[PDB]
Amino acid sequence: TNKAQEIAGKYEGYSIGNCAMFTDYVMGEKSVATIVPNEDGTINVTYDSGSGEFKLNNIKVTSKTFEGSGQVELSMNDKPAGAKDFTLTGSIDEQQKLTLKVNVPSVMGGLTIEFIQGTLPISYHVSGTYNKEANLSVSVGSTTYPDITDCKVSIKRSSDDTVELTLKGLSNLNSSQTGRAMNLGDFTVTDVKVTSTDNSIFKIEGSINTTDTNNTPITGTLSGTVSNSETNITFTFKPGAMPIDITAMFKGKK
């Protein structure tokens, strides 16, 4: 059994992209890499990333590792993206998992794409910037303040099933006829848990225990959902030593 056969196979997973302009972007959720031995002991590799198919032929294998270069027609969108040069490196680890990385240096400051074997982490289904059709409605006791439309929530992956969530816009709170506004800043809630019973509606939940951008302590909880680019989140928190909670309901689209 030669070295090419030792790494032969269909490997399934997902593909993540990084360039000068964005990081951790999903290039494909159901990517496939296929390594097939030739009679002479070389391999052909086909990597369907989901935003481009990368092919190499007649490549040599060393210590479960390979590399090569070629041309790819990228399809991050449908449009006729002309051929670009790429280099590809790949290796199979001791547990038979494939790691694969491609560099397309001539586009967007340097585009790299990584193949990661297995299922897409759930946190990718909630991460993003929800600043479209956005609204933030704040209430305390019997007061409901005017709608804030200058606001957003940003969600960043922290692990497979946790995220970091920043609410911006509370600084724009204006007084109501029934009460004065509070001075409130932006804040970030780490360790927010991501779950789903159907892989279509995603629940985000966590306790809040931090300080805002004016250093006011913020304590409480948040609860929301993401589905098809829309989020709805209720934050219930106490600023400082305030003996009543405030509620902020956010909605927006990414």
Q: Where are the domains of the chain?
A: 1-120, 121-252
Two tokens, residue 169: 């816009």
Check if 1-120 and 121-252 are the same fold. Answer: yes
Solved using: X-ray
CA 254 – CA 45 distance, rounded (Å): 36
Cα separation of 107 and 87, whole Å?
Answer: 13
Place of tokens 């399934």: 12
Name the nearest CA neighbour of 36 among 68, 1, 4.
Answer: 4
What torsion do the CA atoms of 10, 15, 18, 21 make, to the nearest 10 degrees? 140
**Distance between CA atoms of residues 128 and 43, nearest Å:** 38
d(CA 250, CA 28): 29
Specify burial of residue 151 (Cβ count, 10 A radius: 0-12, 13-18, 19+): buried
Calpha distance 110→86 (Å, rounded): 10
What is the token pair recorded at 120? 């897409």
Helix ranges (H only) for the chain are 3-7
How far apart are alpha carbons 163 and 130 in whole angstroms?
14
CATH code for the part of the protein at 121-252: 2.40.128.350
CATH of 1-120, one of 1.10.3720.10, 2.40.128.340, 3.30.450.20, 3.10.310.10: 2.40.128.340
CA atoms within 13 Å, Cβ hemisphere of 238: 8
Question: SS3 for 124?
Answer: helix
CA 221 – CA 98 distance, rounded (Å): 40
Measured CA to CA, the distance from residue 23 to residue 16 in angstroms comes to 8
Type of residue found at 39: E
Contact 148, 135 (CB under 8 A): yes
* Dihedral angle of Cα 100, 105, 107, 111, to the nearest 10 degrees: 30
Q: Alpha carbon of 148 to those of 135, 188, 200: distances in Å?
A: 6, 18, 28
